[PDB]
Nucleic acid binder design. Structure first.
Ligand SMILES: [K+]
Ligand SMILES: [K+]
Ligand SMILES: [K+]
Ligand SMILES: [Mg+2]
Ligand SMILES: [Mg+2]
Ligand SMILES: [Mg+2]
Ligand SMILES: [Mg+2]
Ligand SMILES: [Mg+2]
Ligand SMILES: [Mg+2]
Lengths: 120, 241, 50
RNA sequence: GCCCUCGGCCGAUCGAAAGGGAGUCGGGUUCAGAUCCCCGAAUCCGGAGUGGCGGAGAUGGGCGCCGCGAGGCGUCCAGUG
RNA sequence: GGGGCUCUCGCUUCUGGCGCCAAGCGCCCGGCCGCGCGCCGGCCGGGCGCGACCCGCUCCGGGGACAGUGCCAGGUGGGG
């Protein structure tokens, strides 16, 4: 006495949808991250402009993987050089490589970091 | 006496152009899915169209009383399922080993199911009572059975529900079931069923052959026709006498 | 545009839900904005009524 | 998680570096880059569960009393400017 | 009085307003103290029905064994 239809439209009733519970993983193991931080940072630039950035703007110039973004470049430089960076500016060179201008934090100096990196 | 004076009725009238209509039932006016429309229009078509008696005979099914006593008798002769057949076989194997061996033990009467199994029993005169479902959806598997049962002389009845016959044989659907020989304490009950079945189906098979179905118009068509029949009869009556 | 006949925008009340229905009637000559037009079997003979 | 209730962009999607579309400007700097770098002033959007600080809401009247008065206690009534 | 009997078996027209997510009534189901004798004192919540009549086989209306479609037959056919 209560099954009522106040609408002249029939809609498909909502039926529950089960979450996948596979009996075997399709791939046996997850593939390791190929874009690790050693892959992100390839080599630093040592041109005259790169040297000018180090002792003017406290900035390290790097050649990075083209698929790495600013967040990934920021983390990569932080762990394998133990420095803190302020911001990362990124461009893709006409030759196809990606170049990152990594400005260090004020408490870090880009000159001694470049000295211990080995790109003086 | 203590009723708060602020309470009062606020009736809303649902006349045309006034307060919006209430959420009333619209089931009759629903845009239904095509599968619902198809099966409802199929039912109406069977009512409109001339239904040949060979197809219309299945509309005449057993009454609720007689169906109950028939299924009640048929429940005493259900085919055994997979579980107790194993128990029967395991008991037979151990009894065979120690030490009777064969021990036929008078294989009990059982209900025979399936249209192919039953039709061979009817042709062989070995069926005592045939029960046919009324809603065999591909209605060619059983259109011949009522005539075949009549000629062979075996009493036959039509029951509502192939699912009920299916539940009788532990399956989803059974088209027909047949009564082979029956136990002595059930012979009287089977006899009470046969003569009533035989009066309603075998004895009046001649006018079952000629009883067409359908050919009934829709209520709107009937009502307006009846309105016209009443429309002039209200002055023909004044005309006469 | 492309029609040499003015169109009248007429707003009705939806009889079944709380909403306003907007129609695009072809304007009969003499009807003006702010006029009430009445549509139905029981509407009376006036310019614009349906 | 399920149930009840409510729920028509009534049509996926694509389609503009001149249409719509929030919010960056001034100065300096290179051999070649800048409204993007540096310096200095802003600004938009998004986020803050444990709530970051303030301010608003919001903090007044009535009656019994104490108290010279001012000011205090109890109760009742307000209070989405 | 009034029934076979007819229209109604109706709630909207002077205004460039507003109008939904039920008031009301009835029947109940929980918790509270408690007359402490049960339909029984009163307080917080929840449900159903009438409000919003019943029944029914095509959503409503217009055509309709025609139109139309398939195959063949005759005519027309520098449009090709
Ligand atoms: K654009
Ligand atoms: K031709
Ligand atoms: K031609
Ligand atoms: Mg799967
Ligand atoms: Mg860029
Ligand atoms: Mg929709
Ligand atoms: Mg696009
Ligand atoms: Mg230039
Ligand atoms: Mg030619």
């Amino acid at each position: 006495k209560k099954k009522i239809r106040t609408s002249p439209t029939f809609r498909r009733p909502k039926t529950l949808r089960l979450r996948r519970q596979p009996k075997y993983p399709r791939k046996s193991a997850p593939r390791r991250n190929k874009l690790d931080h050693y892959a992100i940072i390839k080599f630093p630039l040592t041109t005259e402009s790169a040297m000018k950035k180090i002792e003017d703007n406290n900035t390290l110039v790097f050649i990075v993987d083209v698929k790495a973004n600013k967040h990934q470049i920021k983390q990569a430089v932080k762990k394998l050089y133990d420095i803190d960076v302020a911001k990362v500016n990124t461009l893709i060179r006409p030759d196809g490589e990606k170049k990152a201008y990594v400005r260090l934090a004020p408490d870090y100096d880009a000159l001694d970091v470049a000295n211990k990196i080995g790109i003086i | 006496k203590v009723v708060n004076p602020l309470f009062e009725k606020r009736p809303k009238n649902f006349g045309i152009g006034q307060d919006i209509q209430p959420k009333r039932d619209l089931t009759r006016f629903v845009k239904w899915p095509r599968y619902i429309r198809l099966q409802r229009q199929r039912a109406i078509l069977y009512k409109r169209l001339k239904v040949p008696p060979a197809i219309n005979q299945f509309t005449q099914a057993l009454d609720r009383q007689t169906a109950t006593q028939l299924l009640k008798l048929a429940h005493k002769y259900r085919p055994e399922t997979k579980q107790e057949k194993k128990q029967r076989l395991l008991a037979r194997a151990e009894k065979k080993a120690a030490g009777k061996g064969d021990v036929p033990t008078k294989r009990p009467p059982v209900l025979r199911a399936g249209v192919n199994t039953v039709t061979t029993l009817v042709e062989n005169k070995k069926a005592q009572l045939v029960v046919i479902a009324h809603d065999v959806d591909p209605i060619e598997l059983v259109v011949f059975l009522p005539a075949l049962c009549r000629k062979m002389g075996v009493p036959y009845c039509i029951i509502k529900g192939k699912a009920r016959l299916g539940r009788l044989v532990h399956r989803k659907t059974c088209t027909t079931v047949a009564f082979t020989q029956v136990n002595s304490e059930d012979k009287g009950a089977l006899a009470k069923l046969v003569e009533a079945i035989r009066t309603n189906y075998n004895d009046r098979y001649d006018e079952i052959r000629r009883h067409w179905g359908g050919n009934v118009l829709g209520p709107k068509s009937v009502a307006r026709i009846a309105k016209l029949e009443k429309a002039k009869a209200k002055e023909l009556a004044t005309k006469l006498g | 545009p492309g029609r040499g006949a003015p169109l009248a925008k007429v707003v009705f009340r939806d009889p079944y839900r709380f909403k306003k229905r907007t129609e695009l009637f072809i304007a009969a000559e003499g009807i003006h904005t702010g006029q009430f037009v009445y549509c139905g079997k029981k509407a009376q003979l006036n310019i614009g009524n349906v």
